[PDB]
Design a binder for this molecule. Structure first.
Ligand SMILES: C[S@@+](CC[C@H](N)C(=O)[O-])C[C@H]1O[C@@H](n2cnc3c(N)ncnc32)[C@H](O)[C@@H]1O
Length: 322
């Protein structure tokens, strides 16, 4: 039937949209996704922005003719750019990581295409570890900015939901591998589509990401004990996990390497920890804990906390006993 098509700037399969264009939520639709996609491509390729600068128009997101018209202007401009690249003009640099602004758009696009019924993520057992909530792009970006990962680092989102934390980190850092592990059926199911849509859109934009895997599973399992021990950066949105789950996580953290880091929405050790002869076995003895600077109280997880595995604290206490 009626179709809208956007050509890829790097010659991947065109993106196809049905008419009428679908709505995602109260503030997101396919019409606007299309217009923003064109805008971001224009950001990627200055030549394209030029052509699009030359013969802007009153887009009626209501009108098919109008939307087909705008898509045509973009597709024609993409054709001419590809011809330009056949001449002397340098083509778009391949396999670079997306800009922060492009990444935000890509992840929203992937989410809207994969999470078909968002309401279904609220079907959890309340007052349980299953409680769903998403860390915002802005907080994830802060975590990336401040905890600096290198190609030596291994990153894991414990309880990864639909996987959008892991995708953002895979696109912004050069870790060897990123993992997400999610237990609940509904988000784990959506994460499978998120995985596919992300790999497809990233290829469409011609942008690179690191290796990652989104898995279904229980991060408290026997298998996961050793995986946690060998992870250098743990992200865990544990605000609603409870004391029992946190206690079990502490036990698994106590096997992590020196300099390992844990980012969480509820501290695993009090910020003002001081070693004495009664707390000698508390996880607080082997880590520093700092509250990440707030981004400029509600009831929902807002603040996040960085834990760094530092055994010199325990060592020091013993040297002082001598
Ligand atoms: C608040 S959500 C966090 C989603 C995502 N990591 C984020 O921050 O945007 C917490 C997730 O942890 C999951 N979870 C709880 N216990 C788990 C377990 N034992 N193993 C794997 N996932 C678990 C829940 O199913 C839930 O989807």
């Amino acid at each position: 039937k009626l179709e809208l098509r956007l050509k890829s700037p790097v010659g991947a399969e065109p993106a196809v949209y049905p008419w009428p264009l679908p709505v995602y939520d109260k503030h997101h639709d396919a019409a606007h996704e299309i217009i923003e996609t064109i805008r971001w491509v224009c950001e990627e390729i200055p030549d394209l922005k030029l052509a699009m600068e030359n013969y802007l128009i009153d887009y009626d997101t209501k009108s098919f003719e109008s939307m087909q018209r705008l898509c045509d202007k973009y597709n024609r401009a993409i054709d001419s750019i590809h011809q330009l690249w056949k001449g002397t003009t340098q083509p778009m640099k391949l396999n670079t990581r997306p800009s922060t602004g492009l990444l935000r758009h890509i992840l929203q696009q992937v989410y809207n295409h994969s999470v078909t019924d968002p309401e279904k993520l609220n079907n959890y057992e309340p007052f349980s570890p299953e409680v769903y909530g998403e860390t915002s792009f802005d907080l994830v970006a802060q975590m990336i900015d401040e905890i600096k990962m290198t190609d030596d680092d291994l990153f894991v989102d414990l309880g990864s939901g639909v996987g959008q934390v892991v995708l953002q980190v895979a696109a912004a850092t050069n870790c060897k591998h990123h993992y997400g592990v999610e237990k609940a059926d509904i988000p784990a199911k959506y994460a499978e589509t998120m995985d596919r849509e992300f790999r497809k859109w990233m290829k469409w934009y011609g942008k690179k990401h690191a290796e990652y895997t989104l898995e279904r599973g229980d991060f408290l399992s026997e298998e996961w004990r050793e995986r946690i021990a060998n992870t250098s950066v743990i992200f865990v949105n544990n605000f609603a996990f409870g004391p029992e789950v946190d206690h079990q996580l502490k036990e698994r953290f106590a096997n992590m390497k020196e300099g390992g880091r844990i980012v969480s929405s509820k501290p695993f050790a009090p910020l003002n920890f001081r070693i004495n002869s009664r707390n000698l076995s508390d996880i607080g003895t082997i880590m520093r804990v700092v509250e990440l600077s707030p981004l400029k109280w509600t009831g929902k997880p807002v603040s996040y906390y960085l834990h760094t595995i530092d055994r010199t604290i325990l060592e020091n206490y013993f040297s002082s006993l001598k």
